[PDB]
Design a protein around this ligand. Structure first.
Ligand SMILES: Nc1ncnc2c1ncn2[C@@H]1O[C@H](COP(=O)(O)OC(=O)[C@@H](N)Cc2c[nH]c3ccccc23)[C@@H](O)[C@H]1O
Ligand SMILES: Nc1ncnc2c1ncn2[C@@H]1O[C@H](COP(=O)(O)OC(=O)[C@@H](N)Cc2c[nH]c3ccccc23)[C@@H](O)[C@H]1O
Lengths: 374, 369
């Protein structure tokens, strides 16, 4: 399994605490998202600075991204985006979303820019369909927005030796120079000068991410000091596991470990019933006696990510732990929850117009520009 | 010295020939510029393809550039630009000019972007003051125009291993990744898809340059094949030597080997009289007997670049008094430099801005090739 504690201490982060949560709830006048309460988003750098800044200036922005390497995203890919939806609503601040189409063109030898773009456009619909607030969201493709990033990229480039790049990201001498140079493009949007149409200069940036993105942003913090700009504030998520077991990451038969957003209710039912690891007894008699293992049961673990009502989760968790609820029942609860989530997602996605989509790419929205001088 | 013949064969170029010149004169209905006639621009790749292309389609574009590393350029820096002025007039085609401010920011550790920009703006005036046709010219700064270049840069990046970049340009592991990645930005404008406001896609590109730029464009030709786009056509110039001697390059006490465009008539006179190498005899008696060495005399060599009238040059060349030939050069330089400064001083913000406008109708002539 992934020892997340050993990552905190090795990468140099701090755990998000109960007092961080209360503080957040005080500043946003709203219950904190379950991801924070339940330790999904569990780690940070400079969170207190950010919260202090928001308290004084009612102002920061949120940055996250998606590398369009596949036509259809899975549930794990949406964790950061659901969290950004919450952050955006609760704090009432802009959210900027990078589609690193350059990255995925550069890293996949047989993929054309044209092919990457079909993936990007579909991915963007999936991203929008989580319910992002169009009025406070700016999505951009690096292939189209590089002109705005480049001056900042130049400064980041200048402050990154080839040695550092190769060491931090594990590049070798046969890698193309696009790969060597991409990380500066992922780092750039942490600096509000990249969005002059709607942000003031040197506004703090909150960067929600799965823990795999940290090498970029750990580097970004060193470079920020050299640029005399705010260090990016990071909050890291654990990985949502695959169905096969908790000691894994949901990734991409191998698609039987993954819930795709294009999956039908039929396919979801079958994946859960047949492939989702059960933490219960092998017999009903044994289950009644020993109970369910919550740490290993995939359906319970998934319910931690998806079920908004705390009481309902603790009710299910206690019954399953005690043996009062069967593996068949908890799997059935998950399926109903997933089916609802996925059907709502597809309903929203199908309904998106070109006009609605294009609006997310418009940097001159008045609601976005409220922080332009702020 | 620089053995230019050994470069041709090592880099893989071909010499420009008399038949290339005649061919050019036939197609442009105009005498060829002295740089070609006198072997200043001496080397090329795919020149015949370009000339044939122009004959069939009356269409190509010219690309060259300047790295703004100094507040004022010297005469050597203008050689390519004078030549582009001619090419632009003679062929009646667009000229695009890259200011590689990104390059010079990235290669000079103590230079800020803000400092580079003061240099760029001054350099741009120097470039314009050569007499470029504003109606057929597009100047751009990489810091401002990168959005238009990036898709093409990505493809060039993808087709360049770190090994290649390091080999071709001599980078090491302590160089910043900006340096490693810059060459693709220098290469990109060779592909007309970078100028969608005024060029059609996949239009041939003629790239005049001093021979030091060739590593970029030799690479650009290999990559062009992989991108299934036209290979850039190159024409290379020798270096205008420094005053110290012919075995040199004029390069930005060490400024006594260089004629800057900000130099006064007083400073020019002194640099020539005091520092310009003389190919005359050491004694007056010896000079009478052997004559001047034209191959080594800096003042004669400079006159090959600057004197437009062939007869006047051949008259001076046959006769060759070191004091007199130096005095001829000084008058020629002083005129050139004073005209240049006159023009430069006269440039308005409006005139300058116009060069950066990609939507000029005269520029859009080839938009639908
Ligand atoms: N099983 C999982 N459970 C929870 N989270 C997960 C899971 N799998 C992936 N993630 C997170 O989803 C985001 C997008 O992943 P990508 O591979 O597109 O991610 C990429 O290819 C990036 N280079 C794109 C990017 C560009 N700029 C950014 C800024 C912040 C974060 C990400 C980016 C990521 O945050 C990732 O950590
Ligand atoms: N003594 C000399 N005699 C004759 N030619 C000379 C002499 N010194 C310099 N040159 C030529 O001047 C141009 C600009 O030089 P830079 O160092 O700014 O050149 C640079 O720093 C480039 N990276 C800028 C650039 C960007 N794109 C281009 C495309 C073509 C040519 C040049 C560029 C060059 O053509 C150079 O060969």
């Amino acid at each position: 399994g992934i020892n997340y504690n050993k990552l905190i201490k090795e990468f140099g982060c701090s755990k998000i605490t109960e007092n961080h949560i209360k503080r957040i709830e005080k500043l946003t006048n709203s219950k904190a998202h379950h991801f924070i309460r339940r330790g999904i988003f569990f780690s940070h750098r400079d969170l207190d600075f950010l919260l202090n800044y928001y308290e004084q200036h009612k102002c920061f922005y949120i940055y996250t991204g998606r590398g369009p390497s596949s036509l259809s995203m899975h549930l794990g890919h949406l964790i950061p985006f659901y969290f950004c939806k919450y952050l955006q609503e609760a704090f009432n601040v802009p959210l900027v979303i990078q589609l690193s189409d350059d990255e995925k063109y550069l890293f996949n030898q047989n993929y054309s820019l044209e092919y990457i773009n079909t993936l990007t456009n579909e991915n963007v619909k999936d991203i929008i369909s989580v319910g992002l607030n169009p009025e406070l969201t700016f999505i951009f493709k690096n292939t189209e927005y590089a002109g705005y990033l480049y001056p900042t990229v130049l400064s980041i480039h200048k402050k990154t030796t080839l040695n550092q790049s190769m060491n931090v990201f594990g590049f070798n001498h046969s890698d193309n120079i696009g790969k060597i140079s991409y990380p500066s493009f992922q780092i750039a949007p942490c600096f509000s000068q990249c969005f002059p149409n709607f942000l003031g200069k040197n506004i703090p940036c909150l960067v929600p991410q799965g823990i795999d993105q940290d090498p970029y942003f750990r580097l970004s913090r060193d470079i920020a000091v050299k640029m005399a700009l705010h260090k990016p504030v990071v909050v890291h998520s654990v990985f949502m596991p695959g169905l096969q077991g908790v000691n894994s990451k949901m990734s991409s038969d191998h698609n039987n470990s993954v819930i795709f957003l294009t999956d039908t209710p039929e396919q979801i039912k079958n994946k859960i019933n047949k492939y989702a690891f059960s933490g219960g007894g092998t017999t009903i008699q044994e289950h009644r006696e020993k109970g369910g293992n919550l740490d290993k049961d995939i359906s319970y673990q998934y319910l931690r990510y998806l079920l908004e009502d705390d009481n309902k989760l603790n009710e299910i968790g206690e019954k399953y732990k005690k043996g009062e609820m069967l593996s068949g029942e908890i799997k059935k609860i998950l399926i109903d929850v997933l089916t609802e989530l996925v059907l709502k997602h597809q309903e929203k996605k199908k309904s998106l117009t070109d006009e609605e989509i294009s609006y997310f790419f418009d940097p001159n929205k008045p609601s976005l520009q409220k922080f332009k001088n702020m």
